[PDB]
Design an enzyme around this catalytic site. Sequence first.
Site, mmCIF file in Angstrom:
data_model
loop_
_atom_site.group_PDB
_atom_site.id
_atom_site.type_symbol
_atom_site.label_atom_id
_atom_site.label_comp_id
_atom_site.label_asym_id
_atom_site.label_seq_id
_atom_site.Cartn_x
_atom_site.Cartn_y
_atom_site.Cartn_z
ATOM 1 N N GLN B 10 10.269 8.762 -51.665
ATOM 2 C CA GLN B 10 10.766 9.951 -51.002
ATOM 3 C C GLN B 10 9.954 11.146 -51.274
ATOM 4 O O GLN B 10 9.670 11.931 -50.376
ATOM 5 C CB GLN B 10 12.102 10.613 -51.420
ATOM 6 C CG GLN B 10 13.461 10.134 -51.072
ATOM 7 C CD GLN B 10 14.522 10.966 -51.756
ATOM 8 O OE1 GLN B 10 15.416 10.457 -52.450
ATOM 9 N NE2 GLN B 10 14.413 12.277 -51.566
ATOM 10 N N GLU B 60 13.085 1.861 -48.574
ATOM 11 C CA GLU B 60 14.393 2.101 -48.048
ATOM 12 C C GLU B 60 14.233 2.778 -46.743
ATOM 13 O O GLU B 60 13.594 3.825 -46.660
ATOM 14 C CB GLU B 60 15.212 2.998 -48.959
ATOM 15 C CG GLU B 60 16.370 3.747 -48.305
ATOM 16 C CD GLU B 60 17.465 2.974 -47.652
ATOM 17 O OE1 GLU B 60 18.064 2.100 -48.224
ATOM 18 O OE2 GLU B 60 17.696 3.285 -46.502
ATOM 19 N N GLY B 132 9.659 7.583 -60.196
ATOM 20 C CA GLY B 132 10.496 6.695 -59.476
ATOM 21 C C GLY B 132 9.994 5.280 -59.353
ATOM 22 O O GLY B 132 8.868 4.932 -59.738
ATOM 23 N N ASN B 217 8.658 21.963 -51.630
ATOM 24 C CA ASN B 217 7.550 21.255 -51.055
ATOM 25 C C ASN B 217 6.693 22.113 -50.154
ATOM 26 O O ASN B 217 5.564 21.726 -49.837
ATOM 27 C CB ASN B 217 8.078 20.045 -50.408
ATOM 28 C CG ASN B 217 8.612 19.234 -51.547
ATOM 29 O OD1 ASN B 217 8.288 19.439 -52.737
ATOM 30 N ND2 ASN B 217 9.445 18.314 -51.144
ATOM 31 N N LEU B 241 -14.098 16.865 -51.098
ATOM 32 C CA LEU B 241 -13.217 16.144 -51.984
ATOM 33 C C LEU B 241 -13.954 15.343 -53.011
ATOM 34 O O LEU B 241 -13.492 15.231 -54.153
ATOM 35 C CB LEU B 241 -12.332 15.202 -51.181
ATOM 36 C CG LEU B 241 -11.306 15.894 -50.288
ATOM 37 C CD1 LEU B 241 -10.602 14.843 -49.441
ATOM 38 C CD2 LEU B 241 -10.328 16.663 -51.165
ATOM 39 N N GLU B 243 -16.792 16.160 -54.093
ATOM 40 C CA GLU B 243 -17.278 17.234 -54.914
ATOM 41 C C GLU B 243 -16.179 17.648 -55.845
ATOM 42 O O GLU B 243 -16.448 17.931 -57.013
ATOM 43 C CB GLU B 243 -17.757 18.357 -54.025
ATOM 44 C CG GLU B 243 -18.415 19.516 -54.713
ATOM 45 C CD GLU B 243 -18.927 20.440 -53.665
ATOM 46 O OE1 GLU B 243 -18.834 20.079 -52.514
ATOM 47 O OE2 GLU B 243 -19.357 21.527 -53.988
#
Lengths: 428, 428, 426, 426
Positions: B10, B60, B132, B217, B241, B243
């Site tokens: 999730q 789920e 989790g 979030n 990235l 880098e």
Amino acid sequence: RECISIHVGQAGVQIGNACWELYCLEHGIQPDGQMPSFNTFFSETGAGKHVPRAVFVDLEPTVIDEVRTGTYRQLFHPEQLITGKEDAANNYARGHYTIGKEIIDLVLDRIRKLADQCTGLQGFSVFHSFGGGTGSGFTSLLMERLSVDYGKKSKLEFSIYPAPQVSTAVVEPYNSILTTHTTLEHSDCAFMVDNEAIYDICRRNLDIERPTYTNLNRLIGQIVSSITASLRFDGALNVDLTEFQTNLVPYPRGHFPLATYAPVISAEKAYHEQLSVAEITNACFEPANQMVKCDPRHGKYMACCLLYRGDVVPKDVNAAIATIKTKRTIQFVDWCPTGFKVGINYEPPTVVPGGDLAKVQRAVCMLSNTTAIAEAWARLDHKFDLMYAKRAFVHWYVGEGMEEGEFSEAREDMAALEKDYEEVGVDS
Amino acid sequence: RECISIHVGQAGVQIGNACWELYCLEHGIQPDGQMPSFNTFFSETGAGKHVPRAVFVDLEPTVIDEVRTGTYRQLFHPEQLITGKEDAANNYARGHYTIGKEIIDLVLDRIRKLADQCTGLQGFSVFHSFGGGTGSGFTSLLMERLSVDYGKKSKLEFSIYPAPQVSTAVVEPYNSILTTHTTLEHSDCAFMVDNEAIYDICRRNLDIERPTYTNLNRLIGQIVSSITASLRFDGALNVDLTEFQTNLVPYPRGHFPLATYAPVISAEKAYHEQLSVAEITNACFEPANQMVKCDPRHGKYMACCLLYRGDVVPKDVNAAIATIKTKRTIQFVDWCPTGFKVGINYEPPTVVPGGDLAKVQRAVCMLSNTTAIAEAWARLDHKFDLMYAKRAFVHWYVGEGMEEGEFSEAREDMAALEKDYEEVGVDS
Amino acid sequence: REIVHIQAGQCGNQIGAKFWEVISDEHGIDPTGSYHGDSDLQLERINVYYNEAAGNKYVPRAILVDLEPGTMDSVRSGPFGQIFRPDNFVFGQSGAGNNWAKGHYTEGAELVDSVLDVVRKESESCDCLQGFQLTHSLGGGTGSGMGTLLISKIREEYPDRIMNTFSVVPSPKVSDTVVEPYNATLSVHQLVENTDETYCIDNEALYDICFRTLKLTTPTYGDLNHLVSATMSGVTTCLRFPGQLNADLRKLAVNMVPFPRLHFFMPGFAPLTSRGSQQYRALTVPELTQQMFDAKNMMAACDPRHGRYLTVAAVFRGRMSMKEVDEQMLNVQNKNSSYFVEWIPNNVKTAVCDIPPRGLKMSATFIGNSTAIQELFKRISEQFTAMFRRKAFLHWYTGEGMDEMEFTEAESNMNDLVSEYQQYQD
Amino acid sequence: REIVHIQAGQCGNQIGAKFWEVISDEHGIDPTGSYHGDSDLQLERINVYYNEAAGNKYVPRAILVDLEPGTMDSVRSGPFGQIFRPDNFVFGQSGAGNNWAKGHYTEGAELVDSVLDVVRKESESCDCLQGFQLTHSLGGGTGSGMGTLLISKIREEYPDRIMNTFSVVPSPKVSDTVVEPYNATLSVHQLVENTDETYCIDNEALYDICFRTLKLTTPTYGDLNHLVSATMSGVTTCLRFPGQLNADLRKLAVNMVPFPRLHFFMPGFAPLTSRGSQQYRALTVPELTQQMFDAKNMMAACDPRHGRYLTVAAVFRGRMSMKEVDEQMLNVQNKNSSYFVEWIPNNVKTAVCDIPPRGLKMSATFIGNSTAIQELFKRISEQFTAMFRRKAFLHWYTGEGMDEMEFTEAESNMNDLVSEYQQYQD
Ligand SMILES: Nc1nc2c(ncn2[C@@H]2O[C@H](COP(=O)(O)CP(=O)(O)OP(=O)(O)O)[C@@H](O)[C@H]2O)c(=O)[nH]1
Ligand SMILES: Nc1nc2c(ncn2[C@@H]2O[C@H](COP(=O)(O)CP(=O)(O)OP(=O)(O)O)[C@@H](O)[C@H]2O)c(=O)[nH]1
Ligand SMILES: Nc1nc2c(ncn2[C@@H]2O[C@H](COP(=O)(O)OP(=O)(O)OP(=O)(O)O)[C@@H](O)[C@H]2O)c(=O)[nH]1
Ligand SMILES: Nc1nc2c(ncn2[C@@H]2O[C@H](COP(=O)(O)OP(=O)(O)OP(=O)(O)O)[C@@H](O)[C@H]2O)c(=O)[nH]1
Ligand SMILES: [Mg+2]
Ligand SMILES: [Mg+2]
Ligand SMILES: [Mg+2]
Ligand SMILES: [Mg+2]
């Protein structure tokens, strides 16, 4: 430049129904034959009606009657619609011998009539199923005669491959074993597909958990049209049916190229996704789109043919080939270099109105001969063996004049066939 | 120049929801994919729809269903939305092994499909949570496979750091300890944030005493976008990235850079106040904006990366750096000179319509590797120990095939990790 | 993903009568069987408890079991008795009479085969079972007696499914059957090791709550079983509906069981106060946590602060902040640290669902596993011993073949659970 | 392509009364004889069972035979007794009295010549016969006695046509004639080797189904024979109507007979449940397969899981996917692999018709050939022996000339079928 389609048995005819429907869709042919616009398959009348050059055989009136009462009843010539009264009963012994052998002469004469209508018979193809009475029984009977009269013409067969898990015919192994014996030796090439594998395609690529045969045969029709309509239509690389045979059959045994088809995509799956030629061909080498439940990774390749529709540029194809030759895990038999037939038609892929597949701008059909087929025979070997060891159901054949030795023999012929696959697997 | 986002669990998916929403906000992408205008993350269709190159995994159905019923359901390709039926139950033993291991093959094949869609895969990043079942269990399972297939690609992980005070998962220590063991060794870099610390940010800088995960979030999304959208967009110093990895990971262990983000300011707090680059970076070295509850003053710095959005002039940055190097109490480890990566994008910072953060004209993200992280491990050490000494809840893992020795081992691996931090702390 | 529920005994049948009522309320399903709701979610996860039969009829996935047609009939006669199919009514003729031996050992045993057959038929009807739930009384003949027998066979068939049960525990003051502790003792002997978890409901405590906080002066069992169903329904809906946390029953079981044998639970519920005060209440997370922690809002006649808390689950329904929940749970842990067990760091676990119970803005379910539970076992064991020595009504039981040494072992086993709670009470 | 049906004995005549009713229902043919339907298919394949007589009258291709005018009269008196022509009523005068010897050996033998003459007249009226079907009781005088005689002569005239029969098998509990096992024994002796296949119907099992799943408390033989006709009509309609699979009776016979002598069948039928539950049923292929496999839905008092399955035919009516059918049959084979015989790979065969039975969306007919069948033979043989030793009522039979050594051989032959089932039971 002409050819004949032959539809034997329900499977043969119902698939044919989809096939001829698709050919009508290809050119805008009206149910009455009126076409406003492919004479390789059709014969023209002064009314501008065209007759599909095909023969429909059923020994039970019902399926042909289904044709006779449907829309395409106006399309088909009454003489093309041949029916007997009784069935083969799932049984070669009646299909090939006792029953079907009575009507076959008529059938042949209608075929010959059409052969006389042909001016340049290229050849023909027969639609049937490996397990049924007429589907395989009668079918081989026909081949026995057609291979005499039309010895130099294309003898391509298409048959439903018996599903390993579901079969409605308890003596299907016996039927199929007998056909092996008689078809191997007469036919040029036999193609087959597995309805179980197809179900998996329908549920995974089309997202359909309710396939009926009328769905299943649409998909088959797609594959067939790629090699029948579009091979007569214009392209870059116009490949003929004889060329197919000349490019797909490597040995004088048979061979059995299996079908794979990509794109098979639901409308929603087509959205948000851009296929290229290369991407479609990537899908073609995935087990997931394999139309027969047999693992491509198990065996080794012997033949492979890729046929292209719509927006395909050879440039891209070449790149795609390079990667399938080198990127994949496709093992191949020594004997063969990778000369894979590329057919490239400009003719776009077509979709059945109200069908499941998405409109695509390009499409690729793959034929392949893999050594994994021997496992399919192994399946039959044991199924046959079990029955035959107990002699279950044997009286249903014996009473029609079949011999037990014959059945053993046919199994042995299959065993020999498996051994030849073994041979090919041994690289050399 | 492409990358893949992976959302597991999730936490992974709901964070992802914010992330992809932000990417849509970055370019004006419509829920149906229509974009009128970043193909490093997206794959284009002929309709001009773009597909976010990402995989969503939930064992789920519910959370993925939440996606499937929301607005972005049109954006995501149905194959990207992968769901199982049953859960891991907060438990690595099922997440990594018993349950998640069944579906992972599918998941991987969708990943591989996207990897084949990539032309120049730069790498990928995985969003999850350290406690989790799927969040950490399944996650490490994935890394086990991805590190084989994509061994040379970026393997960046982002995970929620278990809050020391509130946790809903009683065996979270056990889960996290097992992940350490398996992620340390496979991943390249793992980043983490503390929702408790974030709450403090929300209440002090945003002035919000009611944060939900949908707020939390958004803030995470800000940080992520700075390093994902804006690193592909134009700037002065365009940092990749790879880098990032090449500039943030100093040792072959892992390392765990922590996030800090400044500006995090409510609209009213933005009024009457002028931030400069230097002032924002001053805020970045304040404990108060530290996204993990761990005291920056406790440890020593090893790495630090500052990434800039909008109105940033290197001139000012240089001055700012000079002062953070010399003015602050930032102790740093010998090993390191202060080569702090400066990424400078012209790309302005973006704000979520209806969000909490004020429109800013410039923004700075900070990544940092501090020795204080060992204290976080110490927290886990005792929590694990307590449970493990009593063997509370142990049967929920043992029944799935876990070994007690394994658990001890994993703790020991953590202890070793702590010892390596100790080592780094010793200056040399 | 799906659950099968079996009700047994007059108690179990009447509790289930309220349980299913509530579930259909949750989903907008009419007493006659069709769906007339109005939310997407209402149908979306309906599968866990209903089979949709042709015509948009929903069949509750449960079996009603008894040995007297009349009770079954009374259930059937009300709303929602029509939603159950006739095939879910499995019953015999002639009671049990609240006799374990009859229920389990002899006569009721005979019926169980037909029950199980239907169970099997339903297990096939499901796509994938998550588990099973049974409702019954611990001191009753069919409730516990026959019910236990059934459980042992279901567990045998499905080791991999959740087996839990909720049961009425003999209250200190109101026992009906003279040998109610005997039946209970025997059920412990059988159930504890043949279940994943069991919930402890005390009617006496329930009657106190209904007057104590709810200030009601007329409840019946239907009103108290409403409260029971609130906790039962609270648990499974989250599993059904979208939330924030971790919404799986098995995961709940994993987090609440530290030891193979100690799986007894104390349910509690919030908010749960009279209407008068509802004008003076504030709805916050601390408000719910105050009601959840308070022992008087427990449905079990125990006292968690007497014992030690091994595990705590806090399930929340409705929109709440994560922060607030985290902080208040932490605070609870902090302030009541003297009751929690030191071996488990952060012993309070949470689960969060975003769907509120119909009519409320928010709600919370308290599930605990304390050592205090052992006190109930102690009361029963003691009472048992006295009866054991005298063989009160044991001629009825021994007359049906129940042997005293089996009972002796049952007594030990009760004492074993107490000693193990002591072993982890420390 | 066509079929001739002959009914005999009070049983056979009353069963046929329902059978023909149903066939006319299927085709929309009025009780008076004319066609008043409404579907193309209804007339299209009508030929198999009807002759269209001038005036758009349809004559059922069947002969009604008895030795008492009164039964025939009662048949004639109802609807559909008017559709039969007078020429199809062949009967004598004075019973048989449930005496094989009279029926077969002596008196009934006299009538058979007139019956056969009419049979011949009808065989000429057909274009091409597929076969013949007879309805009768195994323990009855005209049902089995005279009926058997007829069969031996028809088979003689038409070796190449299908000869099958459906027959009421003496139920363990309700025998009417004291020597009912004797008559049955003699019919085995004659029938088994003079038929292609025979179906085993047990009234006791039928009475259980009607109350067990159909929950009915008033059936008569007409209601049970309705169920019988459902299976009979199920078989032939597919042959008549368009489908998907392989719709030929002979092919069915071929697939179901592994050995020349073991051709006994256990019919079953789905869906077949009470209206209450119809609101709680779902209509899927697995649903039908669940009802088909379940032994309680068999019409024969056997238990297929006791014996081994040699062959299984699953006939489906209505629109179903091929996939689903294939998969569920496979699943059956897989899960019940312990009952199937290992010599026959994929022992479950299917047939599919796209026309549903009037009023239903879908339906399925179960036909099985298990070894379990032998148990019926064993019961009869045993009972026979006892009677044989005492000659109970054999003075009636020996009085009409039936010799005891013929009976002795009949006994052996029963035992032979059992031993052959054992030979393939393994
Ligand atoms: N909270 C509730 N407890 C109940 C209820 N009915 C009974 N009980 C309690 O359950 C026990 C008595 O059991 P039952 O009615 O369930 C007995 P049962 O019908 O299972 O079996 P028999 O021995 O065959 O009668 C006892 O502790 C009663 O006090 C109820 O409706 N609600
Ligand atoms: N399912 C049914 N079985 C029947 C019926 N009538 C009779 N029977 C059964 O058939 C056997 C008795 O036979 P009948 O009435 O058919 C005797 P039948 O008239 O053929 O010859 P006679 O000896 O000349 O009377 C026995 O097993 C009865 O129990 C019926 O209507 N339905
Ligand atoms: N793909 C496809 N397979 C079919 C179709 N119809 C039947 N089959 C398959 O082909 C086999 C059935 O053959 P039958 O219909 O029994 O027989 P037949 O071959 O038509 O000939 P007879 O036995 O004499 O009736 C089975 O394996 C079916 O799964 C169809 O329309 N499409
Ligand atoms: N920042 C943030 N943290 C979250 C969010 N959802 C959950 N978490 C945190 O992540 C952990 C919860 O993990 P779960 O939701 O229980 O489980 P999961 O990792 O999704 O996988 P399963 O246990 O199998 O359900 C807790 O520490 C939560 O505080 C979210 O949306 N945002
Ligand atoms: Mg056919
Ligand atoms: Mg989850
Ligand atoms: Mg009672
Ligand atoms: Mg009579």
